[model samples]
Target: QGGPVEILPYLFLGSCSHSSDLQGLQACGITAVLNVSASCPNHFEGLFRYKSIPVEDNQMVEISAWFQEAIGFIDWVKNSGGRVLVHSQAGISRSATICLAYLMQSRRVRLDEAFDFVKQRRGVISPNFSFMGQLLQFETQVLCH
Candidate 1:
């Protein structure tokens, strides 16, 4: 069962494979879909409103640059009472990077705190290696400095 994993009360972090779990998503009340990969289509036009961010995994893409936008979109949906799904093709790298940054940047939770917090919910959320470095730098500016 490729169900969307709940990362927040109304937020889900999942794989594009799970994105096609339309019945499961609708059953869980997800109205906002955030597609983190450049190629993964939003899947349903009438059913789910979507926002897609363009980032390829381990391609030296500056995913950090897209952090704030993703964070902003997340809050908008959640605050508006819509459950959101943030997914890349795998939900292991690109989408996870955005979620990690959201906790540090918006929640002011430190990287390690955010990491453990998220992993406690979903265990396989290993972002790209360089994405790890990118998040550490963000922590310096957002949490450490």
Candidate 2:
């Protein structure tokens, strides 16, 4: 919600992983949370220990998994009567990348155009081209019906 005016609905990306912050998110009209982080076994006993309940996170290899999580969050928001919030450790690459994908799919823009659109909005959308390519490749491989 705190980004450019143009790309607002496609995704609401941010940074802050505190459990108490989730309540503040609720006050800010965020209904659900999507945390994008690779759960490290070397970390705490629980992967989501640092987050709040109803926070859905995905630790995956292919970018499509991230894409699905993004879209799924939108659906949850629609059904649950609230807004969707997505964030990572930093709100740059991972969060922005997922936001770009959702904007492209929902707004009917091409990949590059979507990237540029998000950049124009946030100006820091740095999705490595190689990883983006692999994400597109994953799309062709997996199509939901």
Candidate 3:
């Protein structure tokens, strides 16, 4: 919760480590933590609402399924007036990709718009090429619906 950055009103993106800056995640009003990093341990289980997808940041890995599930959790939290943090090992590729996908799915935005939306706030999301390809496909699929 140490290096959290708000990517949206109720959503945040960050690394999977706790910082000594005790203000840490609390400053973001994060009531739930979603861990998308494969190797990071889930340390918030007893401390706060927690979920883990445990996927490696690889081109071959498909994250759409996990993104769907996480979006549901995020929706619940926001509707309930709580905040959620989506985090990965480095808060760059994996977690940022998930936030982009969630924005597309929930806000019904195009991939480019979603990218700009997050980049304006976080500014460092470079999902692996494969992830971007999948996100492009995801954009098409969502647009069709």
Candidate 4:
């Protein structure tokens, strides 16, 4: 139950490669995997409930388009009484960004609140500047509205 740290009650954040470690995930009681980085190869599909959002780690890749979809998946897993492991390459930028977005959208919190919440659980999360900007924009467009 230690490989993937739970950022929220039922939401976990870890490395993309960590998804391959089925034992580690199962030990953590994770029933679903959401891969934010497209580059991470999926060695196991049917073993667990899985969803992949193929996002590149770059300033050009806008992650906002997939926020609702990812958030919906997170909600679905939680409502089903399951845990979801959200991961990107390093479990930092991309995955953290989506987790932050989900926290803001699903929990009705601001970006800083979400960031602080997640950072407290996983201190290494540092979303890229571009992702940060997208999150800021999302806060303005969605959270504000």
Candidate 5:
């Protein structure tokens, strides 16, 4: 397994949208899909529509909406008990951001630690610094006591 994976007792999240990545996940025992983007062109058509969203183009800027949506999907995944393939138009920003947020919320990993963990997993993982900062603030408001 690569650094992009953390097979803990909880659900897993992927940050890339490559076909091979999906297939590899399936092979690695991925039981479900969770597309954080608006549209997934390379999706196997209707095989996983229920698990995907259509937030394409510059929709990633709507960080608030995206964060809420990802939380809902993660809640669903936790109850269902399986891994989730989180992908957007690219792996660097949108997709990775959602995964990092989930870890920060569920695993009790602070934003900075979550970001460092993700970066360690994938060297090319670089999120918008402003978005990262806002996400941390959002977590502080939503999850922190």
Candidate 6:
């Protein structure tokens, strides 16, 4: 099963399967979740805080457009003393892209470094070609900012 993997002390990346595992998520102390798919429904709205970004895992989708927002949400959860899990349909592309963007911007690291950091944690991450391109574009933004 594609379970949740901790990319940071309080940040997790996972799939809908892992997202639905209430017991497991609770065991992991997940206080909020970031759902990064157009179709994946937010499970357990009352038990766990949720922020949904309705976007497809497609090359045409400008996932980077939501990077700042996603990053903000993740940090908000961490600031509030809660862990956050970011999950897409399969936990392979869309969610991974958002994690990479957050790492790059928040950690002040480059794209490749962030990629290796997350890949080491989750191992199954493979952001789409366009997402990779978008990440590179966002690198310029992070590096410049």
Q: TM-score for all predictions?
A: 0.66, 0.52, 0.65, 0.66, 0.62, 0.68
Ranking by lDDT: 6, 4, 1, 3, 5, 2
**Model 5, residue pairs in steric clash:** 37-55, 38-54, 38-55, 39-54
- For residues 28-78, write the lDDT of model 3, one tens digit per residue: 555777756554334345446766666755653566566566566666667
lDDT of 1: 0.61
lDDT of 4: 0.62
Clashes of each: 0, 0, 0, 0, 4, 0
- RMSD in Å for candidate 3, one decimal? 5.4
As a whole number from 0 to 100, the lDDT of residue 72 in candidate 3 is 66
Candidate closest to the true structure, highest lDDT: 6
Candidate 2, residue 129: how far the Cα is off, in Å = 7.2
lDDT, candidates in the order shown: 0.61, 0.46, 0.59, 0.62, 0.55, 0.64
Residue 47: error of model 5 in Å? 5.3
**C-alpha lDDT (0 to 100) for residue 33 of candidate 6:** 68
Q: What tens-digit string does per-residue lDDT give for candidate 5 at 1-145?
A: 3435443545454545553565465636654566554453223324432466556466345554555556556656666736666654555455656666676766667666776675553353335433434445756743573
Q: Comparing candidate 1 with candidate 6, which one achieves the higher TM-score?
A: 6
How far out, in Å, is residue 139 in model 5? 2.6
Q: Which candidate, 2 or 4, would have the higher lDDT against the true structure? A: 4
Q: Per-residue lDDT of 1-145 in model 6, one digit per residue for the tens?
A: 2344457667877644655674365545667767675543333455567767777556446665666776777777778838777766644456766777778778877767886777653443334443344455667765555
Q: Which stretches of candidate 1 lie over 4 Å from their true place?
A: 1-5, 16-23, 26-28, 39-45, 57-60, 121-136, 140-145
For this target, which candidate reaches the highest TM-score against the unseen true structure? 6
Error of 5 at 142 (Å): 4.7
